[PDB]
Amino acid sequence: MFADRLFNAMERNEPAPGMVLVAAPSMESEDFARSVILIIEHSEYATFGVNLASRSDVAVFNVIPEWVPCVTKPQALYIGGPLNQQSVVGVGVTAQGVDAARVDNLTRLANRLVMVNLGADPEEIKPLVSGMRLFAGHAEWAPGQLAQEIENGDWFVAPALPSDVTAPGSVDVWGDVMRRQPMPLPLYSTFPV
User: Fold this and answer.
1) Which of 22, 32, 76, 102 could be joined to 156 by an S-S link, Cβ 3.0–4.6 Å?
2) Sign of the C-alpha dihedral, residues 168, 173, 176, 180?
3) Closest listed residue to residue 38, CA positions, set 48, 24, 29
4) How many structural domains compose the chain?
């Protein structure tokens, strides 16, 4: 859904870092079906995001073991998207006390969500985050293309929460995000099966 008519009285949230793009129920492509894509960069150059909804079977230990102590369970790489799947992004939730504007190795997305520079010392970062997840690959939108897709009803733009990034592996991330949205969106949400 996410037809234009949904927004006659209610206004669309604008894409920005820290928003999630929630896949329309009707999206069928294997790479994007039931995805929840956290926007991590939104610029004149392009929009970049990582899917939060798709865990892989690759343990973080086998790729960057040094980061394992900072990673929220399950400590597996999540599949961020179809591009550059050998490249890894860290998304963290800042700990109490932390302002990402004053920590060079953290980049504020919105609220407590940050991109963690994986070149940092994990021992530096550990006290500064309450949770973190690693994503292999990403999704990209050319300039203007995300807007076009939103207008077509492909995505619903919603604020991300820390729990979207730190969710246990038993969770239906797409379903949980749909349940937070205005009616009628919860009517199309799903539970783990």
Assistant:
1) 22
2) positive
3) 48
4) 1
